[PDB]
Design a protein around this ligand. Structure first.
Ligand SMILES: N[C@@H](Cc1ccccc1)C(=O)O
Ligand SMILES: N[C@@H](Cc1ccccc1)C(=O)O
Ligand SMILES: N[C@@H](Cc1ccccc1)C(=O)O
Ligand SMILES: N[C@@H](Cc1ccccc1)C(=O)O
Ligand SMILES: [Mg+2]
Ligand SMILES: [Mg+2]
Lengths: 303, 306, 303, 306
């Protein structure tokens, strides 16, 4: 079992990957970008890729959204919501008062403003490429900064890095959502708290065209948790997360409705919700209701 | 083979039954009212009942809509659209100048205004129970009127009735819609020019509730030709909707819509699929053909099974 | 103040009219049919016409529905829900056991079946034109029946008619709904439990065309209590009763929406509900919500 | 006149600001991030901020979507669609054979694969914070790489930077969408080819909730060109929707839609009406013209007042 991820080593993305069951003791390959992590999977060199999909402090989200929606034959098999905790690290013997410059990824920098502005008002920012690269950069004697903002992972992995501050994020409950992406296989088992992702191409652009797509879910009691339009036909695709599993009668039926409107629709997997909240199923929308209605129609058709 | 129909004999209703193939030589039983007509079918004592459902010269329409919405299951197997022609009728020897009083059903009267005002301006309307009864009343001694407005049928059948004026109605396009109703059996063969009728009880009364029911048809490209709400104490939404859709129950979009209806309202009644009197084919919208439905099912199957 | 009604005198329709405030002591003109009652009003000879619209035991409903929907310049100014109580009447000295034949309107006959089948199983039916005409027919010595089913009004008006049975209807709570129709004037005052009627022509016949019409009400929290399609353009009109008064912001706005789709839409009046049940107004649909939203748009437009 | 933009200098973002009329001779302040850019505008210290909103070679897009959805009111006054052209850059004397390491923003790297794999198959990517920083890093002693991928802008401005390869991107149609954002003032004049942007907080999370919001546009013939949901803890539905519609706030169908949105969600933010970069006029659907709206208002008025 081999996983790729958005590298380098010790980023928030790897930290997320290591909480996946068995991944702490699996082979984890850092890739320089989402496409390469994804190519490895597509080429059979890796079983799955761990990539950010919401609120990454390393960047990478838009590239993930591009990749799953313009790609071919990929399935999301797992998601993860990982609390972000920022630490400030420096080389041993460097005190808080010695810090004149701090390197990190721009996303992390923006999220730690209150702490830094209060506790290090004389510290100026040095743009980094990732939090991990900013941290590893300290290990060079000539580094052009004195501290970095990074994940607790990197701080505990590196004996040459000392934590000077912990939990310095503006929001203590901030989270990144990640997805684990593999080649198509069997559908993960339904848990009752599941999510389904599709990418729906727009056949014709006119008012109410999205409405028509959205209705396939809504008329069937299927809640949505994410929607994004992307210019690419009607010149758009819609990337959509829905509550439920392809196995649920209401969801299977919504998928059929989607295909009829847009037969190039892509299925991106059904998988367990990281939040473990089961869909509240309206009774007229239940598996039993679908079976009862189909049985009633059959009795007419065969009467 | 036994038919019932809304009586008495000689009404526009009978005339309509008379047009159904084989009926002229079949047993035709006139019944007092629509319920009595249907009752006989439900009880196993008649094969089908011919009842009006729109623009009845004799009344009976609301009775029909309520009767088919409750009780033993029934199916519409045929519809008829019968052109309405009115004749003015009287005993032999009676001329236009001799008419002071005219009896007919109020529905007939209201449609013969133009001719009557023009040619019998001094004549008074005497309300009748049906066109046929009005006509038959003339064969009695000292009938309290001198003319009747009725169907050509009853004039042709009664020797004592003379036609004083032909085709006296206000509306050239006037037609009555009838339905022939039986106990449930097989669906007839689809034709591509079919109608499907359902009665949908409202489960819960709120804005957009009907829209939710109508969307089952609209979202699957199913055109409607009739909707009517009716109060009722049987449903906890307090209404039912009587609906005619374009299509046959076996058409994939229609079967699918029917399933959607049952999910919202499990007490939905299926009232049959049957050929359109006017023979006009359903227009099948994009994405809603049997083929599109089958492609979509196969796609979902590949996901489930792959 | 002069009213017409669906005659003759002593029908359930007149009984309904006499419960209208001041009508018991107004001039009430019986008309042989709905059109004539309506012509009188249209010609200025009568102020209003009382005609049945739901569950008439005298007939007349479909003619009412035809008239208000194909007519010109008429407004419904009042509705009434009148409990139906049937009485069986005969000439003095005629006993229950003397009744061989009963005349009434077909609608009344169908609604009294249980009583008659139990209490008079030997009585056969004689079709009548109205319950009142059936009753008045007894006053002739040569009448071809012995009893009639009619309104309590006719029974109490006519000293020559004796009640032999009362409340013989299958349903003790059965009701007829009637409407009072006048020429256009000022809108009746809003009560908070109001109804509005329109007739909407269908511009084009296609799936979802009615949906579009219905949405104008639904998207604005406006409940409907009656809908009927009629073949007559799209070849239909829709006769519609909605909850609310034209004065309510959500209703005025629904009316505007209707006009845009179908500019030949006819307004048939706003008037008090006979059931006196106030609409439950969703907060985002309230007059205050409409005023707040319009004020917010104005601040943008004028900023 | 003072602009801020997502820095540093020489990025694709600056190049885009540079295209706005009068900007080449205006004060242009580079800012660390999107929030800092907007902050300056909000504080009264800059007139407008130029920030990316789609397909940014430099990042910044999610920052933009979140920043304009909360806090002090802002308005988009202009949008720009800027074609992306990549150059390969190095110090003088350095040739293709001399390159083992290339630095750029990951977004640039991912779009230059074809050319790089073909012509520099042995070169390794060194991730940079921005294209500009990658380029500027080459002017330093013993930079840990030998080439950068950046905008033509920074190559033209830096003497120490030599263009080794021109136009090396994978996608001919690649463009970045930017927005120029100011404090609220007057609506600009409508053109018939306008865009309107709003941010709509979800009040309550249930199936069809978004549909209810989208229907405000769809039921009034208003076409959409962008929708994005974003999580947030501020709304009790837990999301907001970022939306671009075809039209100008003064168009009757748009003002009407805006009112519908406010009724559902009173905390709706108005983000401006502004000319479309591509100059494509709104198509005005049947029944939705200013004239139709005015006829309908006048009809309702006749009822109210008559
Ligand atoms: N869950 C709601 C709102 C929503 C839509 C899309 C994305 C996020 C939330 C719906 O299905 O309509
Ligand atoms: N056929 C149209 C309009 C219509 C509806 C119902 C009855 C008659 C006509 C539709 O399906 O919406
Ligand atoms: N009151 C519901 C259902 C209904 C519709 C039409 C007539 C009667 C009832 C609605 O507005 O949708
Ligand atoms: N323009 C179409 C589809 C669309 C919606 C939203 C974003 C992009 C495209 C509509 O208004 O429904
Ligand atoms: Mg350490
Ligand atoms: Mg008496």
């Amino acid at each position: 079992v081999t996983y790729t991820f958005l590298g380098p080593q010790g980023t928030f993305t790897e930290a997320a990957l290591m909480q996946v069951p068995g991944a702490a003791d699996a082979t984890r390959i850092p890739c320089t970008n989402v496409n390469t992590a994804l190519e490895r999977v597509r080429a059979g060199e890796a079983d799955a890729a761990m990539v950010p999909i919401e609120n990454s402090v390393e960047g990478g989200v838009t590239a993930t959204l591009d990749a799953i929606a313009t790609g071919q034959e990929l399935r999301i098999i797992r998601e993860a919501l990982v609390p972000i905790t920022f630490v400030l690290v420096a080389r041993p013997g460097v005190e808080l008062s010695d810090i004149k410059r701090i390197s990190t990824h721009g996303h992390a920098w923006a999220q730690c403003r209150l702490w830094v502005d209060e506790h290090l008002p004389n510290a100026d920012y040095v743009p980094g490429s990732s939090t991990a690269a900013s941290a590893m950069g300290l290990l060079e004697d000539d580094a052009p900064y004195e501290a970095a903002i990074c994940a607790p992972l990197i701080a505990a992995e590196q004996p040459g890095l000392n934590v000077l501050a912990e939990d310095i994020g503006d929001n203590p409950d901030a989270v990144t959502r990640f997805i684990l992406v593999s080649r198509p296989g069997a559908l993960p088992e339904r848990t009752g708290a599941d999510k389904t992702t599709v990418v729906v191409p727009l056949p014709e652009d006119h008012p109410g065209a999205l409405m028509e797509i959205l209705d396939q879910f809504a008329s069937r009691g299927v809640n949505l948790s994410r929607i994004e339009s992307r210019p690419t036909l009607g010149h758009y695709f819609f990337s959509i997360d829905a509550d439920g599993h392809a196995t649920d009668s209401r969801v299977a039926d919504a998928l059929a409705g989607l295909h009829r409107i847009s037969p190039a629709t892509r299925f991106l997997g059904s998988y367990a919700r990281a939040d473990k909240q089961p869909a509240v199923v309206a009774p007229h929308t239940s598996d039993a209701a679908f079976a009862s209605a189909h049985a009633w129609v059959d009795s007419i058709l065969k009467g």
